[PDB]
Amino acid sequence: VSVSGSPGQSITISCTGTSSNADTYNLVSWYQQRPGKAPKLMIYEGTKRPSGVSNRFSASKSATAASLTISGLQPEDEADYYCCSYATSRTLVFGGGTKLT
Amino acid sequence: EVQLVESGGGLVRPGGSLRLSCAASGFSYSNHWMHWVRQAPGKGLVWVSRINSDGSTRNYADFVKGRFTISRDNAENTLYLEMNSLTADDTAVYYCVRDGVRFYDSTGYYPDSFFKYGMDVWGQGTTVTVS
Amino acid sequence: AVTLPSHSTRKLQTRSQTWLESREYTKHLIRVENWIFRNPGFALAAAAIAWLLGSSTSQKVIYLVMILLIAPAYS
Amino acid sequence: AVTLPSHSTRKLQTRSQTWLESREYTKHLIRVENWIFRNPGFALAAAAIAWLLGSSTSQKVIYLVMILLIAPAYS
Amino acid sequence: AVTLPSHSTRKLQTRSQTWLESREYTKHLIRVENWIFRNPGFALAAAAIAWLLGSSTSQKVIYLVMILLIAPAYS
Amino acid sequence: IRCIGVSNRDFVEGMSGGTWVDVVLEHGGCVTVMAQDKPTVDIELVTTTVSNMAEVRSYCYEASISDMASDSRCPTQGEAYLDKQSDTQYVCKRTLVDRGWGNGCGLFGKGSLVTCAKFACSKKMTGKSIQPENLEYRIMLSVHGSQHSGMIVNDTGHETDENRAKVEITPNSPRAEATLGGFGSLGLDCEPRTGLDFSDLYYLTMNNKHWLVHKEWFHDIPLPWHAGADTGTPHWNNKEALVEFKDAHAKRQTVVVLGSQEGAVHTALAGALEAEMDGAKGRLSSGHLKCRLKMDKLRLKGVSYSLCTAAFTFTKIPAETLHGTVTVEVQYAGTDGPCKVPAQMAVDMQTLTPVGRLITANPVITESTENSKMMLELDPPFGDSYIVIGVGEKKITHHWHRSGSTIGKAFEATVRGAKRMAVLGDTAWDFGSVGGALNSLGKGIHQIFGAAFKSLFGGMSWFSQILIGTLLMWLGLNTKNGSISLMCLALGGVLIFLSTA
Amino acid sequence: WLVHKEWFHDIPLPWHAGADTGTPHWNNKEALVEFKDAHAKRQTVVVLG
Amino acid sequence: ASISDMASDSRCPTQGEAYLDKQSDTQYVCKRTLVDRGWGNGCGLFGKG
Amino acid sequence: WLVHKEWFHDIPLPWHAGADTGTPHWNNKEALVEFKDAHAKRQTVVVLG
Amino acid sequence: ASISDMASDSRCPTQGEAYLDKQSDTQYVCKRTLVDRGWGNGCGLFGKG
Numbered sequence A: 001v002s003v004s005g006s007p008g009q010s011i012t013i014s015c016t017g018t019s020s021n022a023d024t025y026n027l028v029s030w031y032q033q034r035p036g037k038a039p040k041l042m043i044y045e046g047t048k049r050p051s052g053v054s055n056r057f058s059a060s061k062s063a064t065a066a067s068l069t070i071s072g073l074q075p076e077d078e079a080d081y082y083c084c085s086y087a088t089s090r091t092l093v094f095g096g097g098t099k100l101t
Numbered sequence B: 001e002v003q004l005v006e007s008g009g010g011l012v013r014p015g016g017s018l019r020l021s022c023a024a025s026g027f028s029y030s031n032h033w034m035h036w037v038r039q040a041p042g043k044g045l046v047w048v049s050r051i052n053s054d055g056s057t058r059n060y061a062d063f064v065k066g067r068f069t070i071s072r073d074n075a076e077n078t079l080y081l082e083m084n085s086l087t088a089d090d091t092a093v094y095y096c097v098r099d100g101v102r103f104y105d106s107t108g109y110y111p112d113s114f115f116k117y118g119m120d121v122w123g124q125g126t127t128v129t130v131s
Numbered sequence C, D, E: 001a002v003t004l005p006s007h008s009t010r011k012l013q014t015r016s017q018t019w020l021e022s023r024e025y026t027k028h029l030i031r032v033e034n035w036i037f038r039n040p041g042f043a044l045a046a047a048a049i050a051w052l053l054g055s056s057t058s059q060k061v062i063y064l065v066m067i068l069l070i071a072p073a074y075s
Numbered sequence F: 001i002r003c004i005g006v007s008n009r010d011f012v013e014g015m016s017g018g019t020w021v022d023v024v025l026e027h028g029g030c031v032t033v034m035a036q037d038k039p040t041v042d043i044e045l046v047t048t049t050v051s052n053m054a055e056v057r058s059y060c061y062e063a064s065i066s067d068m069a070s071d072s073r074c075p076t077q078g079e080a081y082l083d084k085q086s087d088t089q090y091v092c093k094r095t096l097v098d099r100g101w102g103n104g105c106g107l108f109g110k111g112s113l114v115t116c117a118k119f120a121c122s123k124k125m126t127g128k129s130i131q132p133e134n135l136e137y138r139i140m141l142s143v144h145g146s147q148h149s150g151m152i153v154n155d156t157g158h159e160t161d162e163n164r165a166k167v168e169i170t171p172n173s174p175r176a177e178a179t180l181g182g183f184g185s186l187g188l189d190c191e192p193r194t195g196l197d198f199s200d201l202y203y204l205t206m207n208n209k210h211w212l213v214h215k216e217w218f219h220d221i222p223l224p225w226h227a228g229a230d231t232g233t234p235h236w237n238n239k240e241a242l243v244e245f246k247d248a249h250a251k252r253q254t255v256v257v258l259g260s261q262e263g264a265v266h267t268a269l270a271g272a273l274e275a276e277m278d279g280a281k282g283r284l285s286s287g288h289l290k291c292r293l294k295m296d297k298l299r300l301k302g303v304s305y306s307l308c309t310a311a312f313t314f315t316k317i318p319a320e321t322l323h324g325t326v327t328v329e330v331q332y333a334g335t336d337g338p339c340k341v342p343a344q345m346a347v348d349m350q351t352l353t354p355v356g357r358l359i360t361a362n363p364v365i366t367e368s369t370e371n372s373k374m375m376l377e378l379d380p381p382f383g384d385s386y387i388v389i390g391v392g393e394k395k396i397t398h399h400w401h402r403s404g405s406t407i408g409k410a411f412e413a414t415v416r417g418a419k420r421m422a423v424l425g426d427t428a429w430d431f432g433s434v435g436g437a438l439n440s441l442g443k444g445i446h447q448i449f450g451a452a453f454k455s456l457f458g459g460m461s462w463f464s465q466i467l468i469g470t471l472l473m474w475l476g477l478n479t480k481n482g483s484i485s486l487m488c489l490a491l492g493g494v495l496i497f498l499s500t501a
Numbered sequence G, I: 001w002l003v004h005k006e007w008f009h010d011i012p013l014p015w016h017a018g019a020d021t022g023t024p025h026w027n028n029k030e031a032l033v034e035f036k037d038a039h040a041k042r043q044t045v046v047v048l049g
Numbered sequence H, J: 001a002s003i004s005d006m007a008s009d010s011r012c013p014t015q016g017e018a019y020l021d022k023q024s025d026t027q028y029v030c031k032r033t034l035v036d037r038g039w040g041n042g043c044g045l046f047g048k049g
Helices: C024-038 C041-052 C057-073 D024-038 D041-051 D057-070 E024-038 E042-052 E057-070 F215-219 F262-268 F406-428 F438-456 F464-477 F483-499
Strands: A011-015 A029-033 A040-043 A057-061 A066-070 A079-085 A098-100 B003-007 B018-025 B033-039 B045-051 B058-060 B068-073 B078-083 B092-099 B126-130 F021-026 F031-033 F041-050 F063-072 F090-098 F110-121 F126-129 F135-143 F164-169 F175-180 F184-190 F201-205 F210-214 F243-247 F253-257 F274-278 F281-284 F288-298 F312-320 F326-332 F343-346 F372-378 F384-389 F396-401 G033-036 G044-047 I033-037 I043-047
Touching (some): A011 A079, A079 B045, B045 B068, B045 B078, C041 C057, C041 F464, C057 D057, D041 D057, D057 F464, E042 E057, F021 F031, F041 F288, F090 F253, F135 F175, F164 F184, F210 F215, F343 F372, F406 F438
Antiparallel strands (some): A011 A066, A057 A066, A079 A098, B003 B018, F021 F288, F041 F281, F090 F110, F126 F201, F274 F281, F343 F384, F384 F396, G033 G044
């Protein structure tokens, strides 16, 4: 639901779906929403980072969960983070979201 | 850069109808998938629906049991979301989203199962209030 | 659909006129006459196929007529 | 109206499929088969009217088939 | 269901043993031997049906063998 | 590029005039023209639009009858008279009815009864004429070579791309040139007027569905009709076949309408082309064109580039098209600027002997950056082979195996030729028509035999044709003459035309 | 109309089977819908008029 | 007849067969066919989809 | 096992197709349920084991 | 396989054909047949149901 961090440190936000084909996390996408701002995507296809998004953000995935890692935390980083993936072949679903302070 | 602009959001009574619109410019609108997502006040993001380039394929989430109807006009670069029988649970900000990752498939038509995606281009969202 | 079996097969017979009676005769006659008036070359080919079949003259003329009636309906 | 000339006479030919292509085969076969299945006795009547006509065996079987086609369309 | 087509038709041929390589020969022979053991008189009926067909002795013995193989599988 | 996956494409390999090569393009497929020293060009017809058609003879397929009226004459009088009879918006039918001493007219002869009803139409179909003008064919060109992987199916950027072109052809300007920057210019000389034999095809619309329709089938349809462009309230002709004047027990007439007549027209339109329409323009979905390709100003971009000396990688290894050609996508790691890609098909890597054919061109990598991507397709030999890329000790190699044998390839080529002829007539004789004396005589005799075969037969559709095919097969088997050869050939023609499907 | 039997069983249109009670289901679902396809790369569904 | 919200699916050159979740409904007409795919549509292989 | 295609297509059992998403649907409804009839309008449904 | 709550419906010798409301579901197997009826079970006429 929430994670706390200090400037300069690294924080990892996890995303887990229960019993979904053990495939899903290959396609999980990570989105950032700062307070009062339009959502911005930081990660797609599980681990690929778009151009323009800082190299500070990184992503990892397994057969059971996905993880988003932010090293060298900055005061900007405080925001809501959402993971999203396929519920079925024709659907999309966003996670519960984590508020990073 | 591409800019998406929502329109049509406003106060309406429970059970009313409402037509949201989305104006796009600056890219090949006729070739990208489009999405409607929502976020309730003080709540998280909730995916609503998606449509193809031509409008052949339309996918809706489970909470919309046929209440919503997504459509588009590529010649006008316009997206539409018809809404019928509104309730209070749907009062929220609706974001119009462009799907460019599919644009692998520059046609934006073939709706493969579990195709790669990630939503980076969002509109500012329009507020709908069912009160 | 496409088939829609005609009901004149089971014509209900009574003193009162049926649903579409005044049209049957010219119905079939007109269909065949129009189809032939469009494509005469098939009249020639049917004459030839009839002539190459059938020993006597009567069988040849009957073959001509039956081909000229089968082809318009593609039955 | 009743007649309505079919367009398959002038079948427009090209690589792409036509309006109703998947239906022609079973269209005609289904019409004939259903009509014969409804009225069996005409099979016997056609066999007799064939056997009385035509010398050889092949000519008589051709007659039987042509009658059994021309009747279900009442062509 | 009932049919479940046998896979030995497409026997994957390779140096290693297959799934059930111990049972094929005994399988077919056991089925035939058991069925003939249970119902003998059909041997007589097959002898008669074979004897009525086929001129020489070789053809008659071949027809007998083929009947006795085609009956137990009810193929 | 633009042709790779189409699965209905054929190669027009060969150019024996040093120049133009005739080619016939269809909506279904696409043509890849490859020459001796000229880059492999891919051509495809995309859409044919028709605009501002004139309107002729619209039909009314849903009638409505407003108000009935009737008049009876008490047998020894004149004739039953209604003033409505003179109005041409009303249907009037005259019959005889039993009268006398019950109805108040003293006599017992038959009397005259006239019934009239107002005819008011509903939604209805329009036919329009396709003149040779205002017909525009859109032809897309693309070129093999340095193309990326995705660029085979991209949407726009034609003017920027420098390897793809779009040509519009109308009978006002049949001849055009596609300017491919760096490759020169490819000239197309086409005959639009004789494409699909328009001037026999009307454009038919009912309600947001549009077809092509033969002039004869349209002129022979029984329904209410009025010629010319419509407006206001029309004057319907033949205001019948939708109105039924049925008779009661010799004492009345009742007037009924036949409902909506639309499914009957839909199933009557069996074997006609579909079409789609946006705005005034309507884009057909099937046709064919005959364009000769003046390739006298095509150059080769790659020549006079040194070979690349770096290492190559396989991003997605190889794909195999339906026709057997192999598509490879190579990634280049070094930075040598634009340079040739050394690629070939080989067996016995000890001595690399070129086997097979490389159908792309002089492969090049255009960009000069760290990592570049290119795509090339090659035609393998029927045995097992190796795809070799690179020069020495860094040459990436792949194993590739093609199934067919040359006899199978020749058989499939003859089958493709047969289907093309069955579809196109003599214009199939004009497919790869470099142009000689044998080809012209073939085309001439095919024209004559086709005219005869279309005049005699060609009023049949997949069942009359199959039946007459079997009948002529038999009669030719057992007629005992040279007419056996005549009839067996007629059977072959008809039955192939049938089983092409 | 009065309509013979054996003309009211072999007629090719989508047919229900009696009492329309809740949600309708038609057994044929055929002869009323035409599944054309474009040149090998699409599909389109239309209804008869 | 009257028709409604069309939908479609397609799953490759070498995978199984397409399956919409609206095929498990007795109100939808559904047809299954083959389409040309590969190198221009999203899936690397060239058979019929 | 390694099975030869054309033996994994001519097999008579309820067959799904590919994507397992939610509540599955088998397009067979035959060869695994036996609808055995009684007498005097009695009908019974059994499964094969 | 595994089976579940059976159900059934019958009709008058003349009334038409049976239709259960669970036939419009793609998860149920349904079979239709003829049953002897009349004056004993509840519907007066003696044809097959």
